From Swiss-Prot:
Single annotated GO MF: ATP hydrolysis activity
Broad enzyme group: hydrolase
Full protein stretch here: 123 to 444 of 444
GO BP field: angiogenesis; autophagosome maturation; autophagy; canonical Wnt signaling pathway; cholesterol transport; endosomal transport; endosome to lysosome transport via multivesicular body sorting pathway; ESCRT III complex disassembly
The protein's role, per its UniProt record: Involved in late steps of the endosomal multivesicular bodies (MVB) pathway. Recognizes membrane-associated ESCRT-III assemblies and catalyzes their ATP-dependent disassembly, possibly in combination with membrane fission. Redistributes the ESCRT-III components to the cytoplasm for further rounds of MVB sorting.
Major place of residence: membrane
Protein name per its UniProtKB record: Vacuolar protein sorting-associated protein 4B
Presence of the UniProt keyword Disulfide bond in the record: no
Length: 322
């Protein structure tokens, strides 16, 4: 129904976003560290809008905030895109979400795709869409239950869809950009993980330098695709070559007659397919830089210039508290 976490994500487990982490520390940690700065006519900011182009992992960042905000508990629901068979009326969920947060202070509420609460673009909505909107607004404002110790972080890729009434409840609005080259280099290395490969550190630097405007989501697609190359190469080899190479079990031990895919005519190129290679004999190649480049060349960034401009427009013609 409603997701409950106790994240242990640290600031530094979020690649790049130096500027945004600064803004969050100031919007969220500072009032917590020094609540006396925010009394009388001042108050912390109950609502923080995380906005920017897709694929930057806003949620992941939100969990970092949860973690550093005194190990707050992280609660979420996700507003909904393509699914119709679904969660129709719907209203008491908002209520239950805010209540559970109130009971588990300190806590953070995270609402993804908070825009798809405005209900719909060129649809009605207009039924429970109304009932929900006021519900949400009711919990943001506060009944007699104060929401001291609850933070609301809403995430959206399309802040202009956002209904003016929702927006105004978000007093802090923090832009999350596509990643910078060093940060992309770091995400490639990450996503690869401990998948055996032969990329040098220069290769990763290179992959960084070459992905201006790719999102972390983008990079993941490129990597997943690259990961599938040993298998692809193995299933379409028409020939294999006897070679000696390391045991899968113990790299101290060299096995003497592994079989490895190779191009049709070659020193020792025996003709056979994977259906004739014994389980214990296959030696697949490892993920290579040319593998990564191939995926890269087959994948375009998701976000274009018209998108990023449409987002600048919002930052301008609203600012914070607009």
């Amino acid at each position: 129904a409603i997701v409950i976490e106790r994240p242990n994500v640290k600031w530094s487990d979020v690649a790049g976003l130096e500027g945004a982490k600064e803004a969050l520390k100031e919007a969220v940690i500072l009032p917590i560290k020094f609540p006396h700065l925010f009394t009388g006519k001042r108050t912390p900011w109950r609502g923080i809008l995380l906005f920017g182009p897709p694929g930057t992992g806003k949620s992941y960042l939100a969990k970092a905030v949860a973690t550093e905000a005194n190990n707050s508990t992280f609660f979420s629901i996700s507003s909904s895109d393509l699914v119709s068979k679904w969660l129709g009326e719907s209203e008491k969920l908002v209520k239950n979400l805010f209540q559970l947060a109130r009971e588990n202070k300190p806590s953070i509420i995270f609402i993804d795709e908070i825009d798809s609460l405005c209900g719909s673009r060129s649809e009605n909505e207009s039924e429970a869409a109304r009932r929900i909107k006021t519900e949400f607004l009711v919990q943001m404002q506060g009944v007699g239950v104060d929401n001291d110790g609850i933070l609301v972080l809403g995430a959206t890729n399309i802040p202009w869809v956002l209904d003016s009434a929702i927006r105004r409840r978000f007093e802090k609005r923090i832009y999350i950009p596509l990643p910078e080259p060093h940060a992309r280099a770091a995400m490639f290395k990450l996503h690869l993980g401990t998948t055996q490969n032969s990329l040098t550190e220069a290769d990763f630097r290179e992959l960084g330098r070459k992905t201006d405007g790719y999102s972390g989501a983008d990079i993941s697609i490129i990597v997943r695709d690259a990961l599938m190359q040993p298998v692809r190469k193995v299933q379409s080899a028409t020939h294999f070559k006897k070679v000696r190479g390391p045991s899968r079990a113990d790299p101290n031990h060299l096995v003497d007659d592994l079989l490895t895919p190779c191009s049709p005519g070659d020193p020792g190129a025996i003709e056979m397919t994977w259906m004739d290679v014994p389980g214990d004999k296959l030696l697949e190649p490892v993920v290579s830089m040319s593998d990564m480049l191939r995926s890269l060349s087959n994948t375009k960034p998701t976000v274009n210039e018209h998108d990023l401009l449409k987002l600048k427009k919002f930052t301008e013609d609203f600012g914070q508290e607009g």
